[PDB]
Symmetry: none
């Protein structure tokens, strides 16, 4: 169980260890060491998703570890509340960035091992704090240098906490 | 909370009561009594929006109540997933028809109290079922008498359910 703290509220997240082992452990590694602390949601698209994890305030991309394999073939879909890994055009390019689907974005689902088919790997799900997500996805956005859809008011992830057992079964 | 039941799937929608009171109450009235049951999505334009609420299968326009005022000055935007009221050239002409934006349609936003400025009033937003929306926007459309972009195969809203008690 992971819980981050933003200026808009608290969000609790349950990881899918059995469905995306390489994805979750690489994700959990950044959480325990503090890579996600003092990061922002640098890309917020209402009606789509909110994305962060790789930028400090001021839009400087942090240094990430080696990429992971794409485990999107686990059958999980990019429904509302699920978390999936952000990546480049290369399918096995996911590093530290991820996003939360605010609606059902089924076109992002794994439909082959190709360009528009590899999809985006779901590895976690919001259990408590979707109300906080719905307030973040509605903020005002604009251009910030070479990046687009950057919120005017920074949504800063202040701290990340990792726990053990839980009542979300 | 409102839920549509179509032949393509269910769509769950959250209303913005504080931002569009006259719009939501008018809208919810048709939902509770059943005005929207057995209606269709009579206008589907891929990459734009899907629209319904005023036509039964066969393009028979149902009888509507008095028009409502336009509450588009509420600050809400016509981003993807949002619902807005359809209207004629007159700003206070919305009755029963509405549409779902499938992309960001910023040109529909309220940018003044004039002809090309009144915009379109957002009153709701899709929470679960955008996949059903994204499937509806892809159907084949054609002309049906004095109407354009009418789907060949009817997208029928079979039933509408209203949820007024608590919700997540």
């Amino acid at each position: 169980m992971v819980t981050f703290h933003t200026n808009h509220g608290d969000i609790v997240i349950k990881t899918f260890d059995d469905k995306a082992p390489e994805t979750v452990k690489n994700x959990l590694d950044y959480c325990r060491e503090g890579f996600y602390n003092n990061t922002i949601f640098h890309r917020v698209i209402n009606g789509f998703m909110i994305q962060g994890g790789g930028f400090e305030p001021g839009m400087k991309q942090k240094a990430t570890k080696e990429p992971i394999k794409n485990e999107a073939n686990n059958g999980l879909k990019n429904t509302r509340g699920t978390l999936a890994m952000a990546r480049t055009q290369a399918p096995h390019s996911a590093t530290a960035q991820x996003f939360i689907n605010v609606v059902d974005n089924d076109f992002l689902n794994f439909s082959g091992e190709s360009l528009q088919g590899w999809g985006y790997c779901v590895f976690a799900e919001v259990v408590d704090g979707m109300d906080v997500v719905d307030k973040i996805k509605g903020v005002a956005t604009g251009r910030s240098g070479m990046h687009q859809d950057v919120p005017k008011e920074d949504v800063i992830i202040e701290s990340v906490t990792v726990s053990e057992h839980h009542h979300h079964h």
